[PDB]
Design a protein around this motif. Structure first.
Motif, PDB file in Angstrom:
ATOM      1  N   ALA A   1       0.748  -1.276   0.120  1.00 32.00           N
ATOM      2  CA  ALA A   1       0.053  -0.017   0.112  1.00 32.00           C
ATOM      3  C   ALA A   1       0.739   1.135   0.057  1.00 32.00           C
ATOM      4  O   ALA A   1       0.266   2.289  -0.514  1.00 32.00           O
ATOM      5  CB  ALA A   1      -0.904   0.115   1.334  1.00 32.00           C
ATOM      6  N   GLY A   2       2.023   1.147   0.685  1.00 29.89           N
ATOM      7  CA  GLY A   2       2.902   2.451   0.868  1.00 29.89           C
ATOM      8  C   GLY A   2       2.647   2.931   2.113  1.00 29.89           C
ATOM      9  O   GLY A   2       1.667   2.654   2.888  1.00 29.89           O
ATOM     10  N   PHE A   3       3.796   3.609   2.675  1.00 28.48           N
ATOM     11  CA  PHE A   3       3.671   4.360   3.979  1.00 28.48           C
ATOM     12  C   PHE A   3       4.883   5.412   3.903  1.00 28.48           C
ATOM     13  O   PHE A   3       5.593   5.630   3.030  1.00 28.48           O
ATOM     14  CB  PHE A   3       4.146   3.235   5.161  1.00 28.48           C
ATOM     15  CG  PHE A   3       5.417   2.334   4.850  1.00 28.48           C
ATOM     16  CD1 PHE A   3       6.629   3.070   5.244  1.00 28.48           C
ATOM     17  CD2 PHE A   3       5.487   1.085   4.028  1.00 28.48           C
ATOM     18  CE1 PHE A   3       7.798   2.371   4.854  1.00 28.48           C
ATOM     19  CE2 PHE A   3       6.805   0.834   3.882  1.00 28.48           C
ATOM     20  CZ  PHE A   3       8.055   1.164   4.387  1.00 28.48           C
ATOM     21  N   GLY A   4       4.661   6.282   5.152  1.00 31.34           N
ATOM     22  CA  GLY A   4       5.658   7.215   5.357  1.00 31.34           C
ATOM     23  C   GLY A   4       4.894   8.657   4.826  1.00 31.34           C
ATOM     24  O   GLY A   4       3.822   8.902   4.528  1.00 31.34           O
TER      25      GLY A   4
ATOM     26  N   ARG B   1       5.799  11.490   2.142  1.00 28.23           N
ATOM     27  CA  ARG B   1       6.274  11.688   0.627  1.00 28.23           C
ATOM     28  C   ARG B   1       7.254  12.991   0.626  1.00 28.23           C
ATOM     29  O   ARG B   1       8.212  12.976  -0.251  1.00 28.23           O
ATOM     30  CB  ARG B   1       5.175  12.195  -0.427  1.00 28.23           C
ATOM     31  CG  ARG B   1       4.224  10.886  -0.609  1.00 28.23           C
ATOM     32  CD  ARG B   1       3.197  11.216  -1.534  1.00 28.23           C
ATOM     33  NE  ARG B   1       2.177  10.279  -1.686  1.00 28.23           N
ATOM     34  CZ  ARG B   1       1.234   9.860  -0.953  1.00 28.23           C
ATOM     35  NH1 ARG B   1       1.395  10.161   0.179  1.00 28.23           N
ATOM     36  NH2 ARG B   1       0.626   8.885  -1.573  1.00 28.23           N
TER      37      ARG B   1
ATOM     38  N   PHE C   1       9.865   7.746   2.802  1.00 27.91           N
ATOM     39  CA  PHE C   1       8.570   7.072   2.233  1.00 27.91           C
ATOM     40  C   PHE C   1       8.789   6.017   1.360  1.00 27.91           C
ATOM     41  O   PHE C   1       9.989   5.824   1.085  1.00 27.91           O
ATOM     42  CB  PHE C   1       7.322   7.991   1.775  1.00 27.91           C
ATOM     43  CG  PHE C   1       7.717   8.358   0.389  1.00 27.91           C
ATOM     44  CD1 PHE C   1       8.712   9.302   0.049  1.00 27.91           C
ATOM     45  CD2 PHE C   1       7.359   7.707  -0.680  1.00 27.91           C
ATOM     46  CE1 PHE C   1       9.398   9.526  -1.082  1.00 27.91           C
ATOM     47  CE2 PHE C   1       7.603   8.005  -1.867  1.00 27.91           C
ATOM     48  CZ  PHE C   1       8.587   9.024  -2.224  1.00 27.91           C
ATOM     49  N   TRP C   2       7.795   5.012   1.260  1.00 23.99           N
ATOM     50  CA  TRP C   2       7.827   3.979   0.142  1.00 23.99           C
ATOM     51  C   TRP C   2       6.406   4.084  -0.333  1.00 23.99           C
ATOM     52  O   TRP C   2       5.484   4.162   0.190  1.00 23.99           O
ATOM     53  CB  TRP C   2       7.892   2.705   1.002  1.00 23.99           C
ATOM     54  CG  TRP C   2       7.635   1.552   0.106  1.00 23.99           C
ATOM     55  CD1 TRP C   2       6.594   0.732   0.096  1.00 23.99           C
ATOM     56  CD2 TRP C   2       8.414   0.899  -1.182  1.00 23.99           C
ATOM     57  NE1 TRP C   2       6.408  -0.221  -1.085  1.00 23.99           N
ATOM     58  CE2 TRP C   2       7.750  -0.194  -1.512  1.00 23.99           C
ATOM     59  CE3 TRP C   2       9.659   1.567  -1.433  1.00 23.99           C
ATOM     60  CZ2 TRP C   2       8.214  -0.797  -2.717  1.00 23.99           C
ATOM     61  CZ3 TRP C   2      10.263   0.669  -2.399  1.00 23.99           C
ATOM     62  CH2 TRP C   2       9.738  -0.462  -3.189  1.00 23.99           C
ATOM     63  N   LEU C   3       6.437   4.248  -1.819  1.00 28.27           N
ATOM     64  CA  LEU C   3       5.030   4.642  -2.463  1.00 28.27           C
ATOM     65  C   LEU C   3       4.219   3.376  -2.398  1.00 28.27           C
ATOM     66  O   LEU C   3       2.984   3.660  -2.707  1.00 28.27           O
ATOM     67  CB  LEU C   3       5.516   5.070  -3.919  1.00 28.27           C
ATOM     68  CG  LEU C   3       4.343   5.502  -4.644  1.00 28.27           C
ATOM     69  CD1 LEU C   3       3.643   6.699  -4.099  1.00 28.27           C
ATOM     70  CD2 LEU C   3       4.703   5.710  -6.168  1.00 28.27           C
TER      71      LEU C   3
HETATM   72  O1  LIG Z   1      -0.525   8.056   3.863  1.00 30.23           O
HETATM   73  C1  LIG Z   1      -0.704   6.832   4.082  1.00 30.23           C
HETATM   74  C2  LIG Z   1      -1.718   6.560   5.118  1.00 30.23           C
HETATM   75  N1  LIG Z   1      -3.242   6.378   4.768  1.00 30.23           N
HETATM   76  C3  LIG Z   1      -3.403   5.789   3.579  1.00 30.23           C
HETATM   77  C4  LIG Z   1      -4.232   6.843   2.632  1.00 30.23           C
HETATM   78  C5  LIG Z   1      -4.154   8.096   3.262  1.00 30.23           C
HETATM   79  C6  LIG Z   1      -3.789   7.685   4.658  1.00 30.23           C
HETATM   80  N2  LIG Z   1      -0.059   5.723   3.307  1.00 30.23           N
HETATM   81  C7  LIG Z   1       1.138   6.121   2.140  1.00 30.23           C
HETATM   82  C8  LIG Z   1       2.193   7.089   2.586  1.00 30.23           C
HETATM   83  C9  LIG Z   1       3.023   7.522   1.547  1.00 30.23           C
HETATM   84  C10 LIG Z   1       3.080   6.772   0.493  1.00 30.23           C
HETATM   85  F1  LIG Z   1       3.761   7.173  -0.415  1.00 30.23           F
HETATM   86  C11 LIG Z   1       2.077   5.801   0.167  1.00 30.23           C
HETATM   87  C12 LIG Z   1       0.862   5.325   1.043  1.00 30.23           C
END
Ligand SMILES: O=C(CN1CCCC1)Nc1ccc(F)cc1
Length: 211
Positions: free
Chosen positions: A69-72, A74, A78-80
């Motif tokens: 899904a991605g996290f962090g 941007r 982060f990881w997309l």
């Molecule tokens: O931001 C979130 C957390 N949630 C999911 C949708 C909105 C709140 N995940 C995420 C973060 C960075 C990225 F590059 C890709 C995904």
């Protein structure tokens, strides 16, 4: 301008030459909006950044669902997301760029062909057509599925990657960890006992260089 740019190359040619956050639209579909960080300055710009390491504030030892899904943040580390990378790389022929910087030294790698398969491939990596200064450390990883601790190199090195047995590239490894193979490594640049301070992975259409 293009109303629903599908990557940072279509968002740029929309004139916007400032690196930062842009909306792209997967397959040009207005219902598939995705916020991305665009590096609009490196080698002509138009890059979707999909990994950034720079300070060790974010945890990269995360599970399959997190990597899918991605996290962090941007704007920081982060990881997309593998699902995003699959959908972007399905849109056409993409090239991978990796930018590295450690204690003032820089290196890069470009791979003319870069794709990430879908979940039924366990997000299989394709990387071909190396050029650069960092050394071809992704060749080792070509054709490998993605691995997290819960789907073992990920457990054994406390990271996530297209692991083999185990890695020459570990850009989702433990920040500042110089212990053998534990850190943010690019083996053919700085080996396995040197965690790199700054790393970005990014993609754009391979034909961008002459569009
Ligand atoms: O931001 C979130 C957390 N949630 C999911 C949708 C909105 C709140 N995940 C995420 C973060 C960075 C990225 F590059 C890709 C995904």
């Amino acid at each position: 301008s293009m109303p629903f740019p599908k990557d940072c190359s279509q968002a740029m040619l929309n004139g916007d030459t400032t690196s930062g956050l842009y909306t792209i639209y997967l397959n040009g579909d207005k219902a598939q909006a995705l916020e991305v960080f665009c590096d609009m300055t490196s080698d002509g710009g138009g890059w979707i950044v999909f990994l950034r390491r720079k300070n060790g504030r974010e945890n990269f030892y995360q599970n399959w669902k997190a990597y899918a899904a991605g996290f962090g943040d941007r704007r920081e580390e982060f990881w997309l997301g593998l699902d995003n990378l699959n959908k972007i790389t399905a849109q056409g022929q993409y090239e991978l760029r990796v930018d590295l910087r450690d204690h003032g030294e820089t290196a890069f790698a470009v791979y003319d062909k870069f794709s990430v398969g879908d979940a039924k491939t366990r997000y299989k990596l394709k990387v071909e057509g190396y050029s650069g200064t960092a050394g071809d450390s992704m060749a080792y990883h070509n054709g490998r599925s993605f691995s997290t601790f819960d789907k073992n190199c990920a457990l054994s090195y406390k990271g996530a990657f297209w692991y083999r047995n185990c890695h020459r590239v570990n850009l989702m490894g433990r920040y500042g960890d110089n212990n053998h193979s534990q850190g943010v490594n690019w083996f053919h640049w700085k080996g396995h006992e040197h965690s790199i301070q700054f790393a970005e992975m990014k993609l754009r259409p391979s034909n961008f260089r002459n569009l």
